Symmetry: C3
């Protein structure tokens, strides 16, 4: 019941960071590393992991002992961590971007380049296809197919607001959009390129910008 | 050739699911025995391991006494299909493009940032696949086409007898368009931004709309 | 600056294509001579190399009898345009955003995961570029805008005399919309989800549809 409130609380607690991986060489036994940097070094070479705010002044301080370095970096002032994928009972392909507090059901499939925002829920056996986007709290049922490039609009604030809810066995075409708070009924089909602005009854096909009922199917 | 779609499904059935990790660690490593299943680049002090999580996890547990600290880097979970080795291809592929094995990239093609090429996709000579575009399984693009940003060319892996999307030479497709399964877009045709193409496009015609219709013949 | 578009094209023509690799290797490395074209971090046993594949590939072959094993990491092929250093920017850029050099990101802008910013793109102060959105070459967004997930703002690199997409302040654009080349969206306008904007949008109007039309004055 308090999920949406606890998401906003988690976000407000999250600490902005600019995490870097540094490879370096030099007279590293002469170097003094602070507790703030995770360091993996021998006397000759090393690998450092840490926030740029700690690493930058560190490199400046030891410039005379460090011969050369490379800094790798992916993000800036980013607070929300990404989800640990290593133990999930599902399939997540490389280039998928999944934030913390996302729920991925058993034997779901998250394709290359899909993006799952905080609070997103993916039911068991569901495919989120390539480049698809699940906004904050967007909720997908079981054995659904969310087409390549489709956007399910996000709803973080206000926490009392209903997120997008995709019921079971839904197929949504490529590059469609489902707007905030819209419910797509069980077994329904949303055509490629549709913009779904109101609830879709179970077992109907909708299509168009904006989507209209085009057909009622018998399963 | 004629067996290509069959050979794709066979390659996928043969692919082994893996949770590849990169581990940076330190400790008493001369006292550590690494198993055959892990690639390891170490001194007696620090080191880097590449392996499947199913091997690396029980390893890290088995050697907890000797391992002082570690970091695990991971991108994918239970992913079976390898990505394409880009290094020797006679084309341009920008960072963030996600390209699976068994994709065919013609001479002097350009694959922009964030484009996603699924297994079996074919990109002809001189073609640009623009930012965030998606080529589904077996989607075939001719020579000197421009596939606009965010465009989805629908995938057809199964059944193998099904025709894929075929884009003929010199076609330009607008941003965030969709071409549905098995559709042929004729030579020199133009597809407007945001169109959903549901049936074959004649050569040298412009189509537009959701669903797309013929809007003018080009001379 | 009046020269901006010309200078972007100059910068591209000057960028050198590269196939950058990171190589982890092990072997008898004290016996190896690493050329000055490769950045090298090694002890006698193991090392890390950074360099262009054109230099690293014949180096690996020349030294195969000394190198026991290696792993090559690579991201790109024949890529010339560098990416933007994010580290000192006064803004928020999330992981997986792809942002080229000569992109301007204003104070407390937000660049969400998977957004794509091409060379010349300008993002104004307090503007959000949402997940999966694409700013084409020279696309210009004002202050306190919201560019919705999956939206494409069309690019204009050549000809340099052509106007880019210009989004004025306080604009909201819905998900998976498209703004075509040279189109100006007026202050405080709303573009509906899925719209294709083919012509200028008046300030404080709502436009919708494929092609977009005025549906409301706000
Ligand atoms: Cl797959
Ligand atoms: Cl969101
Ligand atoms: Cl380019
Ligand atoms: Cl596909
Ligand atoms: Cl955020
Ligand atoms: Cl562009
Ligand atoms: Mg997209």
């Amino acid at each position: 019941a308090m999920d949406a409130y606890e998401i906003i609380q988690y976000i407000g607690d999250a600490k902005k960071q600019t995490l870097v991986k540094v490879t370096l060489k030099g007279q590293l036994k002469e170097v003094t590393f602070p507790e703030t940097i995770k360091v993996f070094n021998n006397c000759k070479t090393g690998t450092l992991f840490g926030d740029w705010a700690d690493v930058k002044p560190f490199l400046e301080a030891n410039k005379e002992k460090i011969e050369d370095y490379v800094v790798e970096n992916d993000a800036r002032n980013s607070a929300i961590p990404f989800l640990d994928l290593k133990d999930i009972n599902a399939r997540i392909e490389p280039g998928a971007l999944i934030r913390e507090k996302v729920e991925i059901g058993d034997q779901a499939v998250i394709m290359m380049g899909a993006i799952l925002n905080i609070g997103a829920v993916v039911g068991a056996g569901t495919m989120i296809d390539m480049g698809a986007v699940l906004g904050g709290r967007a909720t997908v049922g079981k054995h659904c197919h969310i087409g390549a490039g489709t956007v399910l609009a996000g709803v973080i604030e206000p926490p009392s607001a209903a997120p997008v809810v995709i019921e079971n066995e839904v197929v949504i075409g490529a590059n469609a959009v489902v707007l905030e708070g819209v419910r797509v009924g069980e077994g329904a089909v949303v055509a490629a390129g549709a913009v779904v602005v109101e609830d879709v009854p179970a077992h109907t096909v909708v299509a168009g910008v904006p989507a209209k009922v085009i057909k009622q199917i018998d399963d």
